[PDB]
């Protein structure tokens, strides 16, 4: 448990580093591994939501829109970036747009769960 948190933080730093450069397959593998590792952690933990968002973002970047859309749809309410990825996937595919409106309207109206984070590509 003492080193368990350190590994997750190191994976997060590595995934942001990989996404910063135009290296996407490595980002894919790191996001898959982190998402698999965070499975034991409870859903209430911020780490699970962060890993799910990172995995969904990596899936979106690698043109595999269907998998990203499904992954974001599983936990669209938990995080803001997951809602962003779900909305972008809906725009790219025109599937399930109504869920995107009912989620995005609530998230924007409340702003003006987890809403703010330091990760990459967090929407404003």
């Amino acid at each position: 448990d003492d080193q368990a948190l350190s590994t997750i933080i190191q994976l997060q730093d590595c995934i942001q580093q990989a996404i910063q450069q135009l290296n996407y397959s490595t980002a894919e593998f790191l996001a898959e591994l982190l998402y698999a590792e965070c499975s034991i952690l409870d859903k209430s933990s911020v780490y699970w939501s962060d890993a799910v968002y990172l995995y969904a973002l990596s899936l979106f970047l690698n043109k595999s829109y269907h998998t990203a859309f499904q992954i974001s749809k599983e936990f669209k309410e938990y995080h803001l970036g997951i809602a962003y990825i779900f909305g972008r996937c809906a725009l790219q595919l025109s599937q399930g747009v109504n869920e995107a409106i009912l989620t995005l309207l609530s998230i924007i109206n409340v702003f003006s769960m987890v809403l703010n984070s330091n990760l990459v590509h967090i929407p404003d």
Binding site: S25, E32, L33, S39, I40
Partner: protein, 381 residues
Amino acid sequence: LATLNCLLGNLYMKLDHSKEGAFYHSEALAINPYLWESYEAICKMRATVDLKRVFFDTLPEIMYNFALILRSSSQYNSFKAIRLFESQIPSHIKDTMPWCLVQLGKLHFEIINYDMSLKYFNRLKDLQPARVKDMEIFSTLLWHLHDKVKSSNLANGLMDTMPNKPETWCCIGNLLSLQKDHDAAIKAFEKATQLDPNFAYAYTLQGHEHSSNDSSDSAKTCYRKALACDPQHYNAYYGLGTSAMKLGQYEEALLYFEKARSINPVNVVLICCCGGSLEKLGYKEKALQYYELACHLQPTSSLSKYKMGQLLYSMTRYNVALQTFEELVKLVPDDATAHYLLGQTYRIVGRKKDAIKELTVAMNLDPKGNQVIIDELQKCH
């Protein structure tokens, strides 16, 4: 100064030569160990690094274990990778993570164990219905199982979700080849490779379908295109070798077979084919050497034991030949021509009681050639 080396490696791998690209991928890995794309590029070829120095000089241990798995799979030594999956990579990573499941399914499918691969990456398909990468393996497994309903499920689902990925058209062509049609499978494969080039698997299946269509030149051209797309691909080498035996020219047949076994050392079909090429060339002493590895490499394989028995009977090692044929019959009783060799070896050693029963079995198996079997009974007494 880590991604530049990966880019240089990628351009080198794509354009002319893989050696410099692998070197530059290794240099990039030297700069940073967490460049998994570099590892996949390395493992596309049969190249490896000193992982202990790379990853050390529990997250690094997990990465080290995964690198060992991928290296073993690329080197085609699946038993070790299964064992590391057994000991390391605990269950809560192993089952959920789709890439580990993909690799494990490919490992089990590499061995004759067929059902368990089906189970593993059928759970994969359930986890990620929209997964499109690496489904040609599922297509080849369904073709090998001679099952049509799950192939239809795969094809319908993939066509409905992604109409344009080349694997989808490859699956369509594989089902068409499975059912009755060869020209329709060929048409599906040209569509698959036109939409996405550099896909060597499409050319390999094109060559296989052309070979099954009794068109040698088209199959050769398709296989050569496959090699142009991918420098290392044993399936197309095996296809070219089979075409060469059909054409009778054993020289390039052995050449192609030898090239294929180099990247896939553990495969009974390739080993037996290489041994047959040697036997046609006349190297009796060397051909048995490969056959000896094949029988010990994987028992319960009819072809390897049959080739063993024919070769030993050819040069009269009857003492081991008799036991090879007996265990061949034990593992399968329906071989017609094998029981003939059982009887011949039994009559040569001089145990008539077994010879009569074995030739009776042979007469049962072959109504047409019974007269020659009756002749052997005459020589028996």
